[PDB]
């Protein structure tokens, strides 16, 4: 913990020189992190941060604040027209911020209060380094989990929703998509504005429907779970917009949500019930489509679930269908 003390000192000193140089310009050469051996200092701290005891130690020294200050000043100074040394420093800083925000109420609140830093994080979602995108999305995921009211407000105001959703459309790797969709699933639960901002991004809804049938090479359900959780969270709005329901229908959303009802993942089943609850309301064509696919018996099979949202959503969707039995069914016509 002397070692940690020393590395944090190096970081704070470097930040202080950067802030002097910035403040020289208000009413010496520009500091370069390579000239202060910053990348190895944050690398070490990043490695230490995986251990719970080392994290407690870091927190007594304000490690989160100092590493956030570093990230923020480097982004301000060099933006996205930076070099590899700088991309590297931001990655290892971002990993550390992920580890330090995990489960940590104070650390989340502090970081979300740093508005400059929050803006810097969101800007990195467009980094040439997709791995850096993954790292930044991991931070945002943590910050969006159990966010207090000020932190929710900040996450929204810095444009994290639209940025993440745009990000998702361009990523090539599963790991990046997992972190991006997890952050978006958390964000989608905060407020209706966030739900609207997802639905507004051109191509998002189709993309999200696409994730419901993702073929993970790593024998996991993480992508289906997060993509379906976003969808279930935005379905209340989708239900109001015929254009949006149409996008869903013509990417085979409905037959997929019915197949989800049989999952071993309670998360997948719950997400599907919640989305069906909303999409089964009002629209006779979607009601009839669902009747024709045997939704009624499928939903009846879940109404006794121990899982409160599964039981609630299945029964609600079922009442929607049962109240609107299509004319062709009424023994005919």
């Amino acid at each position: 913990h002397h070692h940690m003390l020393h590395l944090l000192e190096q970081i704070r000193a470097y930040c202080e020189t950067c802030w002097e140089w910035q403040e020289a310009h208000e009413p010496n050469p520009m500091p370069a992190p390579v000239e202060h051996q910053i990348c190895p200092a944050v690398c070490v701290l990043m490695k230490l941060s995986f251990d719970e005891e080392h994290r407690h130690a870091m927190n007594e020294l304000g490690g989160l604040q100092a590493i956030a200050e570093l990230l923020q000043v480097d982004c301000e100074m060099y933006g996205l027209t930076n070099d590899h040394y700088s991309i590297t420093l931001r990655r290892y800083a971002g990993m550390a911020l992920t580890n330090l925000t995990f489960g940590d109420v104070a650390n989340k609140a502090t970081l979300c209060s740093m508005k400059g830093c929050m803006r810097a994080l969101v800007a990195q979602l467009k980094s040439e380094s997709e791995d850096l995108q993954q790292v930044i999305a991991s931070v945002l995921r943590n910050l969006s989990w159990r966010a207090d009211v000020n932190s929710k407000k900040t996450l929204r105001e810095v444009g994290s929703v639209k940025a993440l959703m745009e990000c998702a459309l361009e990523v090539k790797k599963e790991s990046t998509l997992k972190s991006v969709l997890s952050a978006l699933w958390n964000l989608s639960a905060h407020c209706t504005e966030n739900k609207a901002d997802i639905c507004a991004v051109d191509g998002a809804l189709a993309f999200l429907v696409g994730t419901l049938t993702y073929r993970s090479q790593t024998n996991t359900l993480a992508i289906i779970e997060s993509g379906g959780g976003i969808l279930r969270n935005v379905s209340s709005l989708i239900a109001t917009n015929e254009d949006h329901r149409q996008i869903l229908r013509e990417n085979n959303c409905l037959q997929t949500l019915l197949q989800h009802l049989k999952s071993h993942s309670l998360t997948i089943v719950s997400n599907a019930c919640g989305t069906l609850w909303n999409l089964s309301a009002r629209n006779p064509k979607d009601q009839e489509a669902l009747w024709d696919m045997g939704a009624v018996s499928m939903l009846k099979n879940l109404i006794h679930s121990k899982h409160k949202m599964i039981a609630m959503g299945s029964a609600a969707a079922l009442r929607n269908l049962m109240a609107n039995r299509p004319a062709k069914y009424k023994d005919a016509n």
């Binding site: 989990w145 159990r146 790991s175 959780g229």
Partner: peptide
Amino acid sequence: AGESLYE
């Protein structure tokens, strides 16, 4: 989705 350590 929940929170987590860097992966």
